[PDB]
Amino acid sequence: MFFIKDLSLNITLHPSFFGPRMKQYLKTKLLEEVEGSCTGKFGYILCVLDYDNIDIQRGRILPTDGSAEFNVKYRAVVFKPFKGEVVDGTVVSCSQHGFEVQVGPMKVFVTKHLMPQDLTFNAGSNPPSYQSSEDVITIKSRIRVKIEGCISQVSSIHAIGSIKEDYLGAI
Amino acid sequence: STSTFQTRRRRLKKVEEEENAATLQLGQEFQLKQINHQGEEEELIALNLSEARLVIKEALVERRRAFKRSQKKETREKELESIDVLLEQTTGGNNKDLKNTMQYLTNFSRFRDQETVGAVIQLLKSTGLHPFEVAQLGSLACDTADEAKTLIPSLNNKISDDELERILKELSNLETLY
Amino acid sequence: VGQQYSSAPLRTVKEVQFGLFSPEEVRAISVAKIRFPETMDETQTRAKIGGLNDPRLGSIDRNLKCQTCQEGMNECPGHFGHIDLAKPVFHVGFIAKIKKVCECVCMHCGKLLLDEHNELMRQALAIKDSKKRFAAIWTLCKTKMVCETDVPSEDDPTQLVSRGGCGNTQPTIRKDGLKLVGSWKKDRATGDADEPELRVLSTEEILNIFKHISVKDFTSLGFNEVFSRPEWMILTCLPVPPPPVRPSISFNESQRGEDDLTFKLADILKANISLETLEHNGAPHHAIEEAESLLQFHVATYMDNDIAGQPQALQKSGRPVKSIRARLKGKEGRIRGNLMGKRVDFSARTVISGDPNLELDQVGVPKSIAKTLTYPEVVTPYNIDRLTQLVRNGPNEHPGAKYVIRDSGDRIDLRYSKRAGDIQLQYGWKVERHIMDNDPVLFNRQPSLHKMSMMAHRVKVIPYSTFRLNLSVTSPYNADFDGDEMNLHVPQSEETRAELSQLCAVPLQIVSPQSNKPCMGIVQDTLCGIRKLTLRDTFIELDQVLNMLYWVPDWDGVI
Amino acid sequence: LRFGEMERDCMIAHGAASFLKERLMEASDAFRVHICGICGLMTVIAKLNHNQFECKGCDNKIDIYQIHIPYAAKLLFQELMAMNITPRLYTDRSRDF
Amino acid sequence: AGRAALYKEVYNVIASDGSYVNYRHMALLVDVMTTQGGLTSVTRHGFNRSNTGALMRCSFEETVEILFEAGASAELDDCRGVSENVILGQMAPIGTGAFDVMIDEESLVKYM
Amino acid sequence: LKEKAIPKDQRATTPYMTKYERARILGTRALQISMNAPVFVDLEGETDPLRIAMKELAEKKIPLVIRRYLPDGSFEDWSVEELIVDL
Amino acid sequence: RLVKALEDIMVHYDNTTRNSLGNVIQFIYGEDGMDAAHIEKQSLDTIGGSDAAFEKRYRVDLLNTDHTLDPSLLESGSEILGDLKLQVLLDEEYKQLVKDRKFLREVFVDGEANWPLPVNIRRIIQNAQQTFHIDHTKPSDLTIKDIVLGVKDLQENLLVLRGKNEIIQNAQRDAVTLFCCLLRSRLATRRVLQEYRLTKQAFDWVLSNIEAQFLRSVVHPGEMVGVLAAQSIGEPATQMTLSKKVTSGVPRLKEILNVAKNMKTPSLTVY
Numbered sequence A: 001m002f003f004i005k006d007l008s009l010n011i012t013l014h015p016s017f018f019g020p021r022m023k024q025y026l027k028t029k030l031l032e033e034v035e036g037s038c039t040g041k042f043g044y045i046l047c048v049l050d051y052d053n054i055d056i057q058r059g060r061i062l063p064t065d066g067s068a069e070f071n072v073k074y075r076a077v078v079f080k081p082f083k084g085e086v087v088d089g090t091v092v093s094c095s096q097h098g099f100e101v102q103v104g105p106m107k108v109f110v111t112k113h114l115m116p117q118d119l120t121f122n123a124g125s126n127p128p129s130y131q132s133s134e135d136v137i138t139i140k141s142r143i144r145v146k147i148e149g150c151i152s153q154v155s156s157i158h159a160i161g162s163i164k165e166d167y168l169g170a171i
Numbered sequence B: 001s002t003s004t005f006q007t008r009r010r011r012l013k014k015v016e017e018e019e020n021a022a023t024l025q026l027g028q029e030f031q032l033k034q035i036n037h038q039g040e041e042e043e044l045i046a047l048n049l050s051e052a053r054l055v056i057k058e059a060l061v062e063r064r065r066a067f068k069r070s071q072k073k074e075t076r077e078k079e080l081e082s083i084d085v086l087l088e089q090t091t092g093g094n095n096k097d098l099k100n101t102m103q104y105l106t107n108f109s110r111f112r113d114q115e116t117v118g119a120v121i122q123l124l125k126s127t128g129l130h131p132f133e134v135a136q137l138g139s140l141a142c143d144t145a146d147e148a149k150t151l152i153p154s155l156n157n158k159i160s161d162d163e164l165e166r167i168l169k170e171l172s173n174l175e176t177l178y
Numbered sequence C: 001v002g003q004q005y006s007s008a009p010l011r012t013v014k015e016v017q018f019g020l021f022s023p024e025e026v027r028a029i030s031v032a033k034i035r036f037p038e039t040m041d042e043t044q045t046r047a048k049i050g051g052l053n054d055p056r057l058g059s060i061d062r063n064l065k066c067q068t069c070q071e072g073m074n075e076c077p078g079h080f081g082h083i084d085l086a087k088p089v090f091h092v093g094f095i096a097k098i099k100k101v102c103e104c105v106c107m108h109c110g111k112l113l114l115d116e117h118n119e120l121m122r123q124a125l126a127i128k129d130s131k132k133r134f135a136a137i138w139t140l141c142k143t144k145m146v147c148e149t150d151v152p153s154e155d156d157p158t159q160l161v162s163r164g165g166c167g168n169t170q171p172t173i174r175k176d177g178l179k180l181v182g183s184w185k186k187d188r189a190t191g192d193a194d195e196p197e198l199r200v201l202s203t204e205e206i207l208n209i210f211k212h213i214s215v216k217d218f219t220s221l222g223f224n225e226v227f228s229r230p231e232w233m234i235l236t237c238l239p240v241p242p243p244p245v246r247p248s249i250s251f252n253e254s255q256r257g258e259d260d261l262t263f264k265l266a267d268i269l270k271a272n273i274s275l276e277t278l279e280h281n282g283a284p285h286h287a288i289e290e291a292e293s294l295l296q297f298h299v300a301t302y303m304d305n306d307i308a309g310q311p312q313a314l315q316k317s318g319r320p321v322k323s324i325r326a327r328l329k330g331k332e333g334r335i336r337g338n339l340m341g342k343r344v345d346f347s348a349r350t351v352i353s354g355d356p357n358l359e360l361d362q363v364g365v366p367k368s369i370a371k372t373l374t375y376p377e378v379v380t381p382y383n384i385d386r387l388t389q390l391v392r393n394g395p396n397e398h399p400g401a402k403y404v405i406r407d408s409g410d411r412i413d414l415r416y417s418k419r420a421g422d423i424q425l426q427y428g429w430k431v432e433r434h435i436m437d438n439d440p441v442l443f444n445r446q447p448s449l450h451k452m453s454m455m456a457h458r459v460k461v462i463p464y465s466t467f468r469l470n471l472s473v474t475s476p477y478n479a480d481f482d483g484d485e486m487n488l489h490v491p492q493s494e495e496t497r498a499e500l501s502q503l504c505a506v507p508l509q510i511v512s513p514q515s516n517k518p519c520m521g522i523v524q525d526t527l528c529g530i531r532k533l534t535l536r537d538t539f540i541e542l543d544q545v546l547n548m549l550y551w552v553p554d555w556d557g558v559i
Numbered sequence D: 001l002r003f004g005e006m007e008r009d010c011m012i013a014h015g016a017a018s019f020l021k022e023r024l025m026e027a028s029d030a031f032r033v034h035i036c037g038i039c040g041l042m043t044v045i046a047k048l049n050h051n052q053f054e055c056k057g058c059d060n061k062i063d064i065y066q067i068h069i070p071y072a073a074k075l076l077f078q079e080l081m082a083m084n085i086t087p088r089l090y091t092d093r094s095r096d097f
Numbered sequence E: 001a002g003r004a005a006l007y008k009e010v011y012n013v014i015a016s017d018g019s020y021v022n023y024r025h026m027a028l029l030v031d032v033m034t035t036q037g038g039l040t041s042v043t044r045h046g047f048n049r050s051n052t053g054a055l056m057r058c059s060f061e062e063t064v065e066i067l068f069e070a071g072a073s074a075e076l077d078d079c080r081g082v083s084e085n086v087i088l089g090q091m092a093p094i095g096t097g098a099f100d101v102m103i104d105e106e107s108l109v110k111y112m
Numbered sequence F: 001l002k003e004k005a006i007p008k009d010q011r012a013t014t015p016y017m018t019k020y021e022r023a024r025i026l027g028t029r030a031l032q033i034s035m036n037a038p039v040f041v042d043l044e045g046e047t048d049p050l051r052i053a054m055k056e057l058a059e060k061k062i063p064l065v066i067r068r069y070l071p072d073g074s075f076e077d078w079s080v081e082e083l084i085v086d087l
Numbered sequence G: 001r002l003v004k005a006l007e008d009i010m011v012h013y014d015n016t017t018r019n020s021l022g023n024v025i026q027f028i029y030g031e032d033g034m035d036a037a038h039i040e041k042q043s044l045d046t047i048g049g050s051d052a053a054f055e056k057r058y059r060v061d062l063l064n065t066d067h068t069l070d071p072s073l074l075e076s077g078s079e080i081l082g083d084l085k086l087q088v089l090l091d092e093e094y095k096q097l098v099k100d101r102k103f104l105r106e107v108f109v110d111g112e113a114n115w116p117l118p119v120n121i122r123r124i125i126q127n128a129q130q131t132f133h134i135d136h137t138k139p140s141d142l143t144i145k146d147i148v149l150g151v152k153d154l155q156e157n158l159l160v161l162r163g164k165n166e167i168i169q170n171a172q173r174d175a176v177t178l179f180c181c182l183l184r185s186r187l188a189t190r191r192v193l194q195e196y197r198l199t200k201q202a203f204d205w206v207l208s209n210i211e212a213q214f215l216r217s218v219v220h221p222g223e224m225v226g227v228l229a230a231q232s233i234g235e236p237a238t239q240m241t242l243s244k245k246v247t248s249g250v251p252r253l254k255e256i257l258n259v260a261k262n263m264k265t266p267s268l269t270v271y
């Protein structure tokens, strides 16, 4: 589900910060761009694992301006969904079309027309809810979701979920 | 424009993007065999929930130590605020994704102690099962074989129902209280 | 360098792969939809229509439209277009090879003539070269005739083992302008009576055999799998170069101004429309190709207009045509006149005059030239005082500056502006200043035949409009004074100044690797005088002696 | 002024690499084009605002590279493309050596 | 010996006109003409036929004719030569560019 | 193919700094100095960036390392600290 | 044409001269690895002269009264006269000079003494004579053990190609061979004490300076030789403003670079 993977980043650094502790700033600007990034290939880069001993390596100077390029090898906590993965989380928003279940940093939407038939959307419910036999689905409700499709965006990945299958639904 | 690593040579073509179902078919980046920065082949590290919490926490704790080096010259709900205080002193602040992660991760952490987590991995990574399955089993509340092999359908014939049933029983026993 | 920041990471081009366009890629790359042979004009109205040049292509009238991309000409590169063809057309430069492959591969079935079975072919296949291997082959396929069904193996010539099929005879092909003619054999002096058979090899037929050539048979000849399939030597879909390649000049507004290539493409499409119109209409069986050869003419002359065919495909004026090949030919032709040798900025050309007073390294730059020529200096805590005063002095008074560049990509024209007199210079900014004394400069006298002829010089800004140099540097330069002109170059970064002052400096070029000897000597007046001075006959008295001693700047002051 | 073929040769002889480049770039052409990672052709849409890239035809928004090349080179590559020849631009070594 | 005969002849052209030239210069030219096995001429037919870079070879007369048969044979230019980087406007592996200059973070700390 | 990169031993290139090497280091440093990079050597009162680089080289307090290239693709690493300045 | 045919050629870091593909043209540039700017026409004193006069300038014989060094030239001269151990080392110096006599005559059949060679040795000693202010009367203090060994130790410092194995070190011998012959021709026992008047301080200064100037006389890996060589031949061709009535100059140079089957004027010399 969650991943520890090795990856790199190329940083262009102005001559101005060739000071005594550029090792500090290199690691600082690394975290500012890396921590919180989201790509279609790698996914949510959540946190940089193992600070210190991050081998910056001997970086080369650019041909024209005195700037430097550094290839930074590091470990990181990586996370992204798959079109068949089953996870569980907390619900947030709720509408006529379904609810949005949040799993970690990710927001997964489930559609009414992908849930069990015997589930109604209550109109005058506050907060808004879904009703069944004894089952109650509101904000704080814990729901296990099956990921059907994965859609990648700019700094976010979203998924279409389903609870029609058995052993899913609510906990 | 981050990425980097493992990059082979896609000489034109490439080709027909593969669908990524529970058929263990994941993106090229996440295969059973992958290299490390030391320059050697290593098994893919698949983290399960609760284990991921310790992985992030340790990295955050040992971060603050080295973060203060330059600056010279438990009980579920109580952990929620303690991590929240830790976030505003080490993380870049705007990492709202990680804030959402830690709140979620500490809530649905099946285990607590480094003692308990260790024994789970020793039991799971001895069956010789594939990495993604190992992570899914130690993150979801499983009671029955049909509850397990239908949520993680990659298993099916890789292990008999009776053998998996014991593991789930030994998971429910080692499942730490809240 | 090109205005605006890019989120894409910058890198260097390590490898240049040379392949041929695949028709599927031509269609996929472009957003042309190009169909109208009419240039533009929205029914007489300004701006351009969704036909020729513009549909998501390059902008013209200082606008934005360019497939949402915007940017506006400057910055915006040239994205391509695709144009459909009624029938396949031969690429002019490949006619030789297309013919060569046709003699190396039999028709109908489309397979190799000789294989691993026959000798001489073995020694041909073994060579690990791209085009040397392709070169015979050739002769072992030029004999030749007959796509044989079975021949003897690596044993006794009695048991003939079979490989492929189709026992047809191969035609012998010659070159005829833009089309191919194949003469066949038979019919064993009983069918007919005497004469062979003559027919025209149509492009569609030719292409069909090429698309049937086997996978390994591509690589057996000088071709690659996913880069250069022989089927792409023949064009199915033609790419259309965007406006930056063939610019619209537009003098005034109600006038015109299109480049040579735009008209040729309009002639291609005009010819292409007719061939499409005829096909699904009442087409005269074999009077259609009397217009296909006209399409095999425009597409041919569009790429090359200098062939043994002869017609110069002249534009209606007497003018030939600026074909794409002509744009790349030696001298002032993109490669030799625009890439290997460029017209450069920060330079000056004027007449030279001899000065027996300037140092060996020194160059006498005129005041006017020093006023125009510019060096970009950085605002540094070492020269803020040196720069702020220089900016205030203005671009008119000699020791001054004409431009101030801020942290953002912004220009301040000091000669105009509104707050030119004020300005508080900031750390990190760039001030483009005048040529000061002792600025390293590259100094040239074309023709430049030497490592000399291009030397680094110290600047001493002097009155009068002539370049001035030491007499001893005349022989390495050459260089006389009978109306001789010389070039000058000014560096733009501190890094390049070092490359001048540490490798190109005049004092460093004294002794020449040319002939393990000094290339500079004291010549003329000073050489004639040094003799007359150093005579037994000649003597000097106090009054002149003291003067002569003072002329030496490194004199120890001891008479 | 002209910095011709003869003029270039002298700077090679001197070995002044940065200066030879600086004549050909910042004082001449100097242009920023974008290449696709797969096809070495300057065909990518460069919306330098909302970050949208794309190389529809190869189809990807991720693998893109920025290059500083002369404008005459841009022309050269494009003029060769009009003649059906693809001058691919790759930013990494493949054939080794 | 054929090389030596060529050098001895080349020398007798320049040295006959009251001019002296160092061994290495004529010796390099005489080698470049002979090293490849035959006599690689200083001509369009000679050296410009060799395995040298496709984009480099084009900067001499043939231009297009090479560029046509370079894409046909799918020749990859290594870009290790002068002309290659000259056209691409990059710093060529020439004297000053024959190497990479790097910064050491560890050494910088020592200098403070 | 992997490595490549001759270790800090086995180095067999001229230990002397070549005129081509020196001419760039002095240029690359002077550029950086003018670009507001931190200066290591105490300035006697000099303002010219190229002159500072010449004082930086004389005291060998330049934090730069040259990567000399061999025709095969492998390289040697030499620091300006190690390199001898004759010329 | 010459420039365009030689563009890529430069001396790489292993001191070989490749082009762009990696093809070696010269294993050591100029067959010695010396930059042309550090070279002068110095005379090889080994070749020139008769067999008789050669002996009167190089033969050191401690086992003779009429052919030994007069003890007025060396302070330790009188106590060395007749030493067997030292004559062996002196014979190893002279026997080397005789080997050089034949070696150079196997190369230069003409017998031309003056040839382009790196490092001026004439002036490097000329300075030493007046920098220390040494008189041509009072004897030296340089032992024969100091002189003959100091020269042999110097030859181990004149490195062109920094070697490690057999081949490169074996090619190292070949690269410096000619320079060593000139070195031994000037720094022979008789030459040092009789023609010059060096002291220990002057001798160790001369050695330290010959060594240092040689390391400067080496080719700096980076020098674009191809373009430098092409321009060194094409330029003197421009200044060419014009039995010996045989294809001379200009068009003869054209024919050479063209490589045509038929020469304008053939003619073969027979001996």
Ligand SMILES: [Mg+2]
Pocket (backbone or CB within 6 Å): C480, C482
């Ligand atoms: Mg004249």
Ligand SMILES: [Zn+2]
Pocket (backbone or CB within 6 Å): C066, C067, C069, C070, C071, C076, C077
């Ligand atoms: Zn655009």
Ligand SMILES: [Zn+2]
Pocket (backbone or CB within 6 Å): C106, C107, C108, C109, C110, C111, C147, C165, C166, C167, C168
């Ligand atoms: Zn057949």
Ligand SMILES: [Zn+2]
Pocket (backbone or CB within 6 Å): D036, D037, D038, D039, D040, D055, D057, D058, D059
């Ligand atoms: Zn692409």
